[PDB]
Amino acid sequence: XXXXXXXXXXXXXXXXXXXXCXXXXXXXXXXXXXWXXXXXXXXXXXXXXXXXXXXXXXXXXXXXXXXXXXXXXXXXXXXXXXXXXXXXXXXXXXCXXXXXXXXXXXXXXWXXXXXXXXXX
C-alpha cells in the first residue's frame, strides 16, 4: 500500500550510480516489482523489472547493459544498480507495483521517484 524510492545517487555522465527502493504495507514478494523513469519533459517508460516472487529479471533494451534490477524480497526492498550513465539519464526513477502474483501485470501504483544527475 506504500513505497518510496531512495534518494537518487547523482553522478557525472558515464559514471556509476545506484538506485534503491523501500516497500511498505505489503508482502513485497507476491507482486512483481518494476522501474520506470521520466526524462525531463517526457513521459516515463519502463527501464527494468524484477520477478520479485522469484529470482528472474528483465530489462528494457535501452538499459539492458546500463542497469540492473533486483528484488530484496527478504528485506521488503528493491534495487537497481547502474553504470555508464547516459548523459541523457537524468530521469526521475519511480518504483512500481506490477502486481500479477498469478497473472495480468499492470503498473498498479507508483512511488514518488527520484532523479540522479547525469552530469557533474
Binding site: 508482502x27 516472487x53 502474483x101 498469478x102
Partner: protein
C-alpha cells in the same frame, strides 16, 4: 513470503514455500498433548505412505478423472491451494487409503522370497 504467504498464490507458485491454577494446569496439559498428537499424526501418515522426510512425495497411485477431470495446466496455474482443497475435499480419504495400500504392496514385493531386492 512468510507463513501462509502463498495462500493467495497459484498452486504452482505456492509449491516454492513448502519449506516455511488447577483448571489452568488441565488446559495447558491438553494443549501440549494435542500439539504432540497433531505432530505425530502427520508423521505417522507420511511414514505409512513411505515418504517421510520429504516435502514432495512422488507416488505410484494413478490420478482418477473422477476425483478431478481438470488438466495440469489448469490445476497448477488457474487455482490456489484453498480452492483445490475444496474441489477434492470429497475423495481425500480415498486417495489416502490408496496411498497406504500402495506402500504396503511395495514393501511386501521387496521382500519376496524368490525375487527379494
Amino acid at each position: 513470503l512468510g507463513f501462509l504467504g502463498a495462500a493467495g498464490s497459484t498452486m504452482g507458485a505456492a509449491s516454492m514455500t513448502l519449506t516455511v491454577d488447577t483448571h489452568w494446569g488441565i488446559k495447558q496439559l491438553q494443549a501440549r498433548v494435542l500439539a504432540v498428537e497433531h505432530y505425530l499424526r502427520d508423521q505417522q501418515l507420511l511414514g505409512i505412505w513411505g515418504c517421510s522426510g520429504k516435502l514432495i512425495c512422488t507416488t505410484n497411485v494413478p490420478w482418477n478423472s473422477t476425483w478431478s477431470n481438470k488438466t495440469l495446466s489448469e490445476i497448477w496455474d488457474n487455482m490456489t491451494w484453498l480452492q483445490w482443497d475444496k474441489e477434492i475435499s470429497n475423495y481425500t480419504q480415498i486417495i489416502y487409503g490408496l496411498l497406504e495400500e500402495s506402500q504396503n504392496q511395495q514393501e511386501k514385493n521387496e521382500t519376496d522370497n524368490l525375487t527379494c531386492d
